[PDB]
Every structure is written in structure tokens, then in C-alpha cells.
């Protein structure tokens, strides 16, 4: 009766079902966990918000078209405005979190296409001016739940002030490496003939036990159309991709007044 | 004559010393001495002060 295709995930007051999954990935074979006393750093008693924040938050959906080049988000950035997770994040200097990432995209037995879904530690991307290096604004690096998109062209700016955004060039993974090698990162593929969802469970990954969430994104989430969407009755059709993410084993230190980042 | 001692740990054993000279002044650095007693400077008081108690009673 039980199947690699059928799964339920419950966190807090939220549950996901899927009937066309393809197993699930646990990044680097490691489930998230709380920070042990023998690896701890800040000494204040941490806040562990548990069910208030460790639950599924669904981002705005994006549309997959035959011309789409792909999508990216950063974490914890994408969830910074999400319920009590966002509040705990911004009221504290330090935070750590794992995640369950659930990417959703259904179609029909007559559609075709394949999405690569990658979780990338320290997903540093190229800037869009050749007058400077590493020249990206905080606002452009941290778009929040809207994330960003890839392009198949690189057109760096004429003036440095106008190029302070990512050059998210698809085939170079926005960072000077070939996209065909992205499979070295934890990943699944949503191949429409096979499955309608991808599930990745991510431990906290960093060179530190805990860090400043408002300064530093630990993971990138990349969705690339490896094989273009095609549907014979209407090649211009669009199907939604929906991203739902739950923080896990969240832990925060260094409580004070709330952080309100710059918006422009 | 050889002394075998623990090394200071690195990124990811023991070491051996033999003294070659007849004067101790010739020797390499003294071994790590973790001795300390900050209280002789931080609390050189005649009557014991218990932290949780009033300093002046």
C-alpha cells in the first residue's frame, strides 16, 4: 500500500500531501537538529519558537512558460516576512534554522517538461557591472518571497550605479560555473511525466553554529527548466510553480529591539 | 635524555625534545604554564566576600 509517490508532511498547524512524489532528499544525509552545548557559542538562553515558526509558509506562485529561464530564492530571506518566523528572525541578532522545502508543479499526462530543483549552500551570484567586482546592493540581493529570475543573456550596465544587481545567467548558474554540474548540490527533478513535487529537507549549513540571518543567507533555492515546458494544444500555456517552505529546529540568540532593514 | 610531550593542536600528536647544552639558559621556551590566580589583583581583601551576599554588611 505504501509508496515512494505518496507522502504527508506535518509541521506545526500545517500539512502537505502529495500523490506523485519521487522519494525525498535529506541534504548531505543529515536531518536538522538543535545546537548542542558542546558546539554552542552565544551564551544567552536561546528562544526556540517551535510550532509558532516551524511550519509551512507558501510563497507567491510563479508561472512556468515555454520561455521561462528559471527562478531563485535565498533562505532565510524568502521567509523574512512570514508570520512569527519573521518576527523571531528580526527581534534577534542571531538565528539558525533547517528547512523542509516543498516545490509543487502539476500538469497532465499530455504535458512535458523538467525542472531541476537545487539547494545551494552559500549561493553567491555575479554582479551586473564590469566597472566593479562583488557590487550588489542589499535590496537587490534580498528580494524576499518574490525571489528573482534567471536570464539567458548577460548585459552588464554602462554605469556602475545601474548594475548593482545579480547577473543571473542561467547556463553559468549566475556564478561562473556550468549549470549541468549543479547536481553536486542536494536536488530533485520535477519531470512532469513522473512527478508533481520535489521535497528537500535541509540541515543548517554554515561555518558557524549560528549567524546573523539579516546579514547572511545560508541557502539558495534554484529552479531551472532543464527541459522546456511543452503542450501541443497550446505552446503558450502556463502552469504554476508553488514553493512552500517550513523552518525547522529554529533557535535564536541576542534579543533586542526589532531589526528593520532598508527598503531602497 | 629525550622528552616526549603533547603538541599544541592544529587544524585537524606528540613531539620530542633533547637538550644539547650544559646550561639551562640555552634551552628552548618553557612549557605552557596555565597557572593563574586573578584574585590576588581582583579581590585582595582581608575578609572573604561572598558574591551573593552584600559587599558591606
Amino acid at each position: 500500500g505504501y509508496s515512494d509517490r505518496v507522502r504527508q508532511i506535518t509541521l506545526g498547524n500545517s500539512t502537505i500531501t502529495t500523490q506523485e512524489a519521487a522519494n525525498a532528499v535529506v541534504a548531505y544525509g543529515e536531518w536538522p537538529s538543535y545546537l548542542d552545548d558542546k558546539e554552542a557559542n552565544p551564551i544567552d538562553a536561546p528562544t526556540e519558537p517551535d510550532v509558532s515558526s516551524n511550519r509551512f509558509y507558501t510563497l507567491d506562485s510563479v508561472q512556468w512558460k515555454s520561455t521561462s529561464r528559471g527562478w531563485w530564492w535565498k533562505l532565510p530571506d524568502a521567509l523574512k516576512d512570514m508570520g512569527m518566523f519573521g518576527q523571531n528572525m528580526y527581534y534577534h541578532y542571531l538565528g539558525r534554522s533547517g528547512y523542509t522545502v516543498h516545490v509543487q508543479c502539476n500538469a497532465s499526462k499530455f504535458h512535458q517538461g523538467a525542472l531541476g530543483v537545487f539547494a545551494i549552500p552559500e549561493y553567491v551570484m555575479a554582479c551586473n557591472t564590469e566597472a566593479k567586482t562583488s557590487y550588489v546592493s542589499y535590496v537587490n540581493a534580498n528580494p524576499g518571497e518574490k525571489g528573482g529570475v534567471f536570464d539567458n543573456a548577460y548585459n552588464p550596465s554602462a554605469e556602475a550605479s545601474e548594475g548593482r544587481k545579480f547577473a543571473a545567467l542561467d547556463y553559468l548558474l549566475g556564478c561562473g560555473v556550468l549549470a549541468g554540474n549543479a547536481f553536486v548540490y542536494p536536488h530533485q527533478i520535477i519531470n512532469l511525466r513522473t512527478n508533481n513535487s520535489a521535497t528537500l529537507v535541509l540541515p543548517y549549513v554554515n561555518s558557524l553554529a549560528i549567524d546573523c540571518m539579516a546579514k547572511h543567507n545560508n541557502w539558495g533555492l534554484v529552479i531551472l527548466p532543464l527541459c522546456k515546458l511543452d503542450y501541443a494544444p497550446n505552446s503558450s500555456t502556463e502552469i504554476p510553480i508553488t514553493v512552500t517552505i517550513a523552518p525547522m529546529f529554529t533557535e535564536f540568540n541576542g534579543l533586542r529591539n526589532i531589526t528593520v532593514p532598508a527598503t531602497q | 635524555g629525550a622528552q616526549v610531550s603533547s603538541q599544541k593542536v592544529g587544524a585537524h600528536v606528540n613531539y620530542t625534545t633533547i637538550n644539547y647544552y650544559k646550561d639551562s639558559a640555552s634551552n628552548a621556551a618553557s612549557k605552557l604554564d596555565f597557572s593563574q590566580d586573578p584574585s590576588k589583583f581582583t579581590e585582595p581583601v582581608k575578609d572573604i566576600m561572598i558574591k551573593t551576599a552584600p559587599a558591606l554588611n
Binding site: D37, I43 | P44, V45, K51, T52, A55, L56
Partner: peptide, 27 residues
Amino acid sequence: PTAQSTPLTSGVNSQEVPALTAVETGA
């Protein structure tokens, strides 16, 4: 020998007042 570890502690409501002292003592 290492520098001091930090013990697990919660709050207090007590006549023990380690936050106050008198540095006139020379301590």
C-alpha cells in the same frame, strides 16, 4: 586547562543579589 564554561541557568527572585557590590573595598 580551559577558560570558563557557562552553566545552564534560569531566572531568580531572591534575596541573593550578586549584581550589587562595593568597589570601595578594592575588589
